[PDB]
Amino acid sequence: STAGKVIKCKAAVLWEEKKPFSIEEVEVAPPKAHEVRIKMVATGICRSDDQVVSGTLVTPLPVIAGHEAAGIVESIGEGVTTVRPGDKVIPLFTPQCGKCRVCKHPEGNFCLKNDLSMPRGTMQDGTSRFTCRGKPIHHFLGTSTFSQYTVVDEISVAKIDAASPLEKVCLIGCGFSTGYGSAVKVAKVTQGSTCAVFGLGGVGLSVIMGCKAAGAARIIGVDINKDKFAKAKEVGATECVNPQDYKKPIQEVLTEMSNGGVDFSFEVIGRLDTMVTALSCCQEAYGVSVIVGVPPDSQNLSMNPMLLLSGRTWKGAIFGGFKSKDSVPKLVADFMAKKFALDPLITHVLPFEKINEGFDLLRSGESIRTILTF
């Protein structure tokens, strides 16, 4: 029996910015009313977790990061109706409370209960379930998956198919759904269109998958790391360009390549300059540019609003525009029905104890997704 008891387990604690994760024993309190304690099975390394280490994505420290994961329900608090002990689950770093104006809106998904806009690093009730060396440790996006056990609010967890392979479908918790939805739900890429995708990591490859599923005729991958090009072509890029190879700015190159601008562009990096470049390279009268990358804390971009007055559309989205709790079980069912592939995103599978090695693979340009296994 662990139910109703404090669990002592292993977690990766980030005590301060720009330091390795500390793998050590934490205490995980039992779930309170409407909370779920999960035994983690697999978690991916997303660039957003690295941005917490870099300090470009601000959230209270010390913290248990990790938000792209899957595991099995260990216990439920009073009042929980949507999952049961032994269920396979994906934590939802964007919650779906079902009650707020956004959850009720046909097109909104950025639930007002999210912990991304103004991060507190707590449970919904403003407290933490984690202690380490006698110190309270913050949560991250209501998920905190870099731990053998986490506690999540019910609105931050989805039940998934009992037969799903958790070492793959953890990517539906972030990278796959974010990129794929950015193309199919947020941009609504059209058949025969020309798309430009800036950044060919796990999220950008998932954007390419979505553009190809939507029947784009041309998908131009843009990355400064030419080692990313082969995999981008495998999942649907028709051509790849490295801005470092050109004397002209890449917006000019992409405008000429697309005979006056692309139909859809996607920023999947998190730099202010590429967000402006991505907007500029879409057709000035009817182009659509989607910001997917997380921009650096408290920094403003500079842009000429004439880019919008001619007719461009600029938008961004969290988690691919998916209503998280409705969508994640459906995406897992679609994966089980072979409607899309996740293996092309997975370059490395490491034990959890090698989390730091996994982060160094990402930082060095050598990995797409490392999956950590508990």
Ligand X SMILES: NC(=O)c1ccc[n+]([C@@H]2O[C@H](COP(=O)([O-])OP(=O)([O-])OC[C@H]3O[C@@H](n4cnc5c(N)[nH+]cnc54)[C@H](O)[C@@H]3O)[C@@H](O)[C@H]2O)c1
Q: Which 51-80 positions form the footprint of ligand X (CB under 6 A)?
A: 51
| 345 interacts with ligand X by CB under 6 A | no
| 100 interacts with Zn ion by CB under 5 A | yes
Q: How far apart are CA 328 and CA 322, in angstroms?
A: 8
* Cβ neighbours of 33 (radius 10 Å): 11
Which of 26, 46, 70, 222 binds Zn ion (CB under 5 A)? It is 46
Here the tokens at position 182 are 């950015």
| Interacting residues with a copy of itself (CB under 8 A) | 101-102, 105, 107-112, 117, 259-260, 272, 275, 283-286, 291, 294-295, 298-306, 308-318, 321
| 236 interacts with ligand X by CB under 6 A | no
Give the residue nearest to ligand X (CB): 201
| 187 interacts with ligand X by CB under 6 A | no
Q: How far apart are CA 234 and CA 205, in angstroms?
A: 10
DSSP state of 91: E
The alpha carbon of residue 346 and the mean position of all alpha carbons in its chain are separated, in whole angstroms, by 14
Pick between residue 38 and residue 45 the one whose CB is nearest to ligand X: 45
Mark 257-276 with x for binding to ligand X (rule: CB under 6 A) and - for no binding.
-----------xxxx--x--
Dihedral sign for Cα 158, 91, 174, 155, please.
positive
**CA-derived radius of gyration, the chain:** 20
Residue 189, annotated ligand binder? no
Residue 45: CB minimum distance to a copy of itself, A: 21
Nearest Cα residue to 150 out of 164, 161, 140, 160:
140
| 308 interacts with ligand X by CB under 6 A | no
Q: How far apart are CA 102 and CA 148, in angstroms?
A: 32
Here the tokens at position 116 are 């991304």
Residue 348, annotated ligand binder? no
Which of 140, 176, 198, 264 binds ligand X (CB under 6 A)? It is 198
Q: How far apart are CA 236 and CA 221, in angstroms?
A: 9
244 binds, among a copy of itself, ligand X, Zn ion, none (CB under 5 to 8 A by kind): none
Dihedral sign for Cα 240, 242, 245, 247, please.
positive
| 48 interacts with Zn ion by CB under 5 A | yes
97 binds, among ligand X, a copy of itself, Zn ion, none (CB under 5 to 8 A by kind): Zn ion
Residues that bind ligand X in the complex, under the rule CB under 6 A: 46-48, 51, 174-175, 178, 198-204, 222-225, 228, 243, 268-271, 274, 292-294, 318-319, 365
